[PDB]
Scaffold this active site. Structure first.
Site, PDB file in Angstrom:
ATOM      1  N   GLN A  18      53.082  30.383  46.850  1.00 57.50           N
ATOM      2  CA  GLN A  18      51.923  29.564  47.233  1.00 57.50           C
ATOM      3  C   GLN A  18      50.838  30.481  47.761  1.00 57.50           C
ATOM      4  OE1 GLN A  18      51.727  25.758  47.224  1.00 57.50           O
ATOM      5  NE2 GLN A  18      49.648  26.536  47.267  1.00 57.50           N
ATOM      6  N   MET A  69      50.443  33.668  46.851  1.00 57.23           N
ATOM      7  CA  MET A  69      49.953  34.311  45.625  1.00 57.23           C
ATOM      8  C   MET A  69      48.937  33.437  44.905  1.00 57.23           C
ATOM      9  SD  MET A  69      53.404  35.876  43.890  1.00 57.23           S
ATOM     10  CE  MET A  69      54.238  37.237  44.736  1.00 57.23           C
ATOM     11  N   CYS A  70      49.327  32.188  44.683  1.00 58.31           N
ATOM     12  CA  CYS A  70      48.467  31.212  44.018  1.00 58.31           C
ATOM     13  C   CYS A  70      47.189  30.947  44.821  1.00 58.31           C
ATOM     14  CB  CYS A  70      49.150  29.862  43.748  1.00 58.31           C
ATOM     15  SG  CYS A  70      50.336  29.924  42.366  1.00 58.31           S
ATOM     16  N   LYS A  93      45.609  33.035  46.836  1.00 61.38           N
ATOM     17  CA  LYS A  93      44.755  34.192  46.846  1.00 61.38           C
ATOM     18  C   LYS A  93      44.233  34.539  45.429  1.00 61.38           C
ATOM     19  CE  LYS A  93      47.102  37.821  49.469  1.00 61.38           C
ATOM     20  NZ  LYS A  93      45.841  38.600  49.425  1.00 61.38           N
ATOM     21  N   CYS A 153      46.684  43.475  28.339  1.00 65.26           N
ATOM     22  CA  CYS A 153      45.437  43.075  28.968  1.00 65.26           C
ATOM     23  C   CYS A 153      44.275  44.024  28.746  1.00 65.26           C
ATOM     24  CB  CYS A 153      45.558  42.982  30.488  1.00 65.26           C
ATOM     25  SG  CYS A 153      46.481  41.532  30.996  1.00 65.26           S
ATOM     26  N   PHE A 180      48.726  34.721  34.696  1.00 67.10           N
ATOM     27  CA  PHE A 180      48.455  34.679  33.269  1.00 67.10           C
ATOM     28  C   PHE A 180      48.261  33.274  32.737  1.00 67.10           C
ATOM     29  CE2 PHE A 180      48.590  39.022  31.903  1.00 67.10           C
ATOM     30  CZ  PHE A 180      49.306  39.650  32.904  1.00 67.10           C
ATOM     31  N   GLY A 181      47.234  33.098  31.918  1.00 68.50           N
ATOM     32  CA  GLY A 181      46.967  31.817  31.262  1.00 68.50           C
ATOM     33  C   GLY A 181      46.714  31.999  29.794  1.00 68.50           C
ATOM     34  N   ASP A 182      46.542  30.881  29.059  1.00 63.73           N
ATOM     35  CA  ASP A 182      46.440  30.928  27.603  1.00 63.73           C
ATOM     36  C   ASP A 182      45.023  30.773  27.082  1.00 63.73           C
ATOM     37  OD1 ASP A 182      49.221  30.803  27.892  1.00 63.73           O
ATOM     38  OD2 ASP A 182      49.510  29.096  26.505  1.00 63.73           O
ATOM     39  N   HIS A 202      37.859  43.244  33.006  1.00 62.48           N
ATOM     40  CA  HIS A 202      39.044  42.414  32.807  1.00 62.48           C
ATOM     41  C   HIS A 202      39.617  42.063  34.179  1.00 62.48           C
ATOM     42  CE1 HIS A 202      42.639  40.700  31.327  1.00 62.48           C
ATOM     43  NE2 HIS A 202      43.326  41.477  32.159  1.00 62.48           N
ATOM     44  N   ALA A 225      42.072  41.261  43.163  1.00 59.94           N
ATOM     45  CA  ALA A 225      41.978  42.458  43.989  1.00 59.94           C
ATOM     46  C   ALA A 225      41.381  43.592  43.150  1.00 59.94           C
ATOM     47  CB  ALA A 225      43.344  42.873  44.526  1.00 59.94           C
ATOM     48  N   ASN A 233      43.969  34.921  34.038  1.00 61.65           N
ATOM     49  CA  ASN A 233      44.018  36.149  33.221  1.00 61.65           C
ATOM     50  C   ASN A 233      44.577  35.760  31.872  1.00 61.65           C
ATOM     51  OD1 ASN A 233      44.772  38.592  32.114  1.00 61.65           O
ATOM     52  ND2 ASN A 233      45.803  39.353  34.017  1.00 61.65           N
TER      53      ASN A 233
END
Lengths: 388, 388
Positions: free
Chosen positions: B56, B58-59, B61, B163, B214-216, B302, B307, B335
Site C-alpha cells: 500500500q 508502494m502504491c 508513493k 523499458c 507496470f501497466g499495459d 521513461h 523516484a 510504467n
C-alpha cells in the site's frame, strides 16, 4: 543549428561492405551416419523400431555428414526432461543457452575482429541474433561485456528470429553502416539447439525431421561503409535487400517457446513453396540490374533442408556447381539457423581465394543470398563480389 | 552497373520525422488507490498483513492513479498458477500475450495510420517491439496479417527488449527512414503485464515493486524522411541518438523468462544510477549543439518509477514543469515499458497544440527523449520540434 548540415555530415557515402567473417562451433562433433542409434539411445526410444527406421532414412537423406552440438551425452544424462518428447524443461534449457549463446558468439567475434585488424574500440554498433533462448539484459549486453566493447556501442538484440534471419541481420547492418559515417557494425548470429532438442514421437514426424537437421554454430561479421583502402579489406558489398511472405504459406513453419522448450512444426511443403516463389524474388532483385541468367550470379541459399536446394536448382535449371558452397556448409555443419548463410559466405570467399579465382564470389560480379524461415518468409540480399 | 549511382538513387535526403502517433490500451481500468486490496485478494495473500502494508505504501508513493490491464479478475480466477508467486505458468501466459500483443498493437497502429492519412500500402518497413511473450512467426508477422500490410513489408521483430526500448525503436526507425528514399516505417510497441504478474512474497520486495508499477499499452508511429509538404504532417524530427551502459550498474535490473513467466529483479539503486549518469548523456547529446541549459529543451523521460524522475529533476535543477507530460502518462497509465515514452511524445504534442503553443515541443525548439532499462541501459534521442 542546421539539421541539413548535421545530416550531411552524419551519414556515410558508399555501400555497406563485409570486411571480415569469423565462425565458431561447440567442440562436440556428432557424426550423422550413427546419429540415429545415438539419439534413440539417449532419449530412451530404442524399442521404437518403425520410428528409428524413419529417422535413419531422414538422416541418410539429409546430406549432412556432421554437426557440432553443445549438448553432450553427459549433459543429456543429467537432463531427462530435455530428452523426453514433451516435458517441462525450459528453465534447464535457458540455463544452458543464455550462457552458451554469448560464449560461442564471442569466439566467432574475436576471430572476425582479428581478421579486420582494427581496434575493437572502433566498433560502433552491435547486432546479436539468436533463436535459442532470451534473457534481460540480453546476449548483446553479454557480448559487449565479454568482448570489452565500448559501453556506448549501439545495440540491436534480435531474439527468436528463426532460420531466415542471416538475411535479416545483413538487411539491418546495411542501413546502420550506410547512414552513419565511420560506423563499423559487429554482427553476431549464434544458434544452439539445446532449446529445440527433444525425444522422438511417431505422431510428430515434423518435430523429428528437425532433430536430423539443426546444428550449432556462430558467425560474426564486421560491416561498414567507406572502407579505408589497403587497411581494411572488402569481401562483399551489399547493394539491395528485400523481405517477403510467400502466398499460400500460412503455418508452413511454426516454432513456439513453451515450458517444454521450443517446439518445431512443419505444416506445408517448404521446398515446394520456396521453389514456387524464388523466381519472383530473383526478378525483383535482378530485373533492375538487367540480369536474368541466374547461372551468371553467385549463390548463397539457406539450406533449411536439402530438398529446398534441390527443388530450387531444378526449378531454375541452376548448374550443379551453383549450390556447392551452400551444400558444403550443410554437409559439414547442418542447418545452423540464422548463422548458416554467414558460414556459406565465408566458405565461398575462402574457396574463391584459395583456388585463385578473380573475385570473392566465385569469379562472378553479382550474387544473391537468401534466408528462408517462418512466415513463410524469404529474405533477399543482393551482393557484389570484390576483385581478388 | 554503377553501385554509386544505385546508392545515390536509393537513399533519402532529410531527417527521419515522426508523422503520426496513435495509442491503445486494454479496456480494463484498474484504480491504484484500491489495488493493494484487490491484488492481495486475487493472489490469496490477505494473511500477509505486514507485506500488504508495504504494498500500500508502494502504491501510494507510485504517483500512478490508474493502469489498464488485460488481466481481469475473471482471467485471474481461471489461472491460479499465474496468481502464485512462482508456479509453472508460462504456457498460459504465452497463450494470452501472443494474441493480445498484436491485437492491442493493431488498435494503436490503425489510429496512427488514420492520422497519417496515406494508404497503408505505402508502409515499407515495420518495427514491432514487446517485452511480453515471443513466438514464431512473430508479432510482426501477426500485425502484417492483421493490418493488411503488403507482404513485402520489411520487418524488425524486437522481442524481450525491456523499458528501455521506446528509445531503441526510434534509434532504429531513424536509420531505416533516412537511408531509404520513400520508406515509411510503422513502429509499434505493445506491452502486456500478463507475463510478469505474480503473487507477493515478503522476501522478494523488488518483484512486488513491479506489481505496483507496470501497466499495459501500445503506441504506434509512422516515421519517414522527406515528408510531402502539406499532405504529410511532421510532428517531431530525430537528429541524433545514442545508447550506453552506465558504469557500476551490473545487475541493476534483470528479468528472466522462466517456466513461471517473466521474473523481475532490482539489485541496485536505479534512480541513483540514472541520476548520476544523466548529465554525461546530456553533454554528449547537446554539447555539439551548443546547448547547456537543460531547462531550455523539452523533455521526455521513461518513468521507470517516480523516484527516477524526482532524482533527475533534483540533480539537474529542472523546473517542475519540464516533467509534466512524463508525469501525466505515469499518472494515467503507469510504467508501460517500451510504449511509455511514445505515449509521452503523444501527450506533449497534443497539449502543446491544444494550448496554442508555438511548437510541438512545448514551444521550444530542441528536446530530448530518454529510455532507461536493463543493462543499466540509457537510450538518448535528440529531437527537434515542429512549428505549430
Amino acid at each position: 543549428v542546421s539539421v541539413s548540415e548535421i545530416r550531411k555530415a552524419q551519414r556515410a557515402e558508399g555501400p555497406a561492405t563485409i570486411l571480415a567473417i569469423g565462425t565458431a562451433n561447440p567442440a562436440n562433433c556428432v557424426e550423422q551416419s550413427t546419429y540415429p542409434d545415438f539419439y534413440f539411445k539417449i532419449t530412451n526410444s530404442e524399442h521404437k523400431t518403425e520410428l528409428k527406421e524413419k529417422f535413419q532414412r531422414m538422416c541418410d537423406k539429409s546430406m549432412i555428414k556432421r554437426r557440432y552440438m553443445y549438448l553432450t551425452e553427459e549433459i543429456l544424462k543429467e537432463n531427462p526432461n530435455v530428452c523426453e518428447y514433451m516435458a517441462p524443461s525450459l528453465d534447464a534449457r535457458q540455463d544452458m543457452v543464455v550462457v552458451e549463446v554469448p560464449r560461442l558468439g564471442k569466439e566467432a567475434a574475436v576471430k572476425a575482429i582479428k581478421e579486420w585488424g582494427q581496434p575493437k574500440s572502433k566498433i560502433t554498433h552491435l547486432i546479436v541474433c539468436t533463436t535459442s533462448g532470451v534473457d534481460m539484459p540480453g546476449a548483446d549486453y553479454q557480448l559487449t561485456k565479454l568482448l570489452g566493447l565500448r559501453p556506448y556501442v549501439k545495440r540491436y538484440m534480435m531474439y527468436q528470429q528463426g532460420c531466415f534471419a542471416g538475411g535479416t541481420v545483413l538487411r539491418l547492418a546495411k542501413d546502420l553502416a550506410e547512414n552513419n559515417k565511420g560506423a563499423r557494425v559487429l554482427v553476431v548470429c549464434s544458434e544452439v539447439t539445446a532449446v529445440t532438442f527433444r525425444g522422438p514421437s511417431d505422431t510428430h514426424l515434423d518435430s523429428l525431421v528437425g532433430q536430423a537437421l539443426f546444428g550449432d554454430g556462430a558467425a560474426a561479421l564486421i560491416v561498414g561503409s567507406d572502407p579505408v583502402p589497403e587497411i581494411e579489406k572488402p569481401i562483399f558489398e551489399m547493394v539491395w535487400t528485400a523481405q517477403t511472405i510467400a502466398p499460400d504459406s500460412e503455418g508452413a513453419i511454426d516454432l513456439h517457446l513453451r515450458e517444454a522448450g521450443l517446439t518445431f512444426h512443419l505444416l506445408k511443403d517448404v521446398p515446394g513453396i520456396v521453389s514456387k516463389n524464388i523466381t519472383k524474388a530473383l526478378v525483383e532483385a535482378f530485373e533492375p540490374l538487367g540480369i536474368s541468367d541466374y547461372n551468371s550470379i553467385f549463390w548463397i541459399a539457406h539450406p533449411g533442408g536439402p530438398a529446398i536446394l534441390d527443388q530450387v536448382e531444378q526449378k531454375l535449371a541452376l548448374k550443379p556447381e551453383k549450390m556447392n558452397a551452400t551444400r558444403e556448409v550443410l554437409s559439414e555443419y547442418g542447418n545452423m539457423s540464422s548463422a548458416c548463410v554467414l558460414f556459406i559466405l565465408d566458405e565461398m570467399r575462402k574457396k574463391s581465394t584459395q583456388n585463385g579465382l578473380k573475385t570473392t564470389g566465385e569469379g562472378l560480379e553479382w550474387g544473391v543470398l537468401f534466408g528462408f524461415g517462418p512466415g513463410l518468409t524469404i529474405e533477399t540480399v543482393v551482393l557484389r563480389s570484390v576483385a581478388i
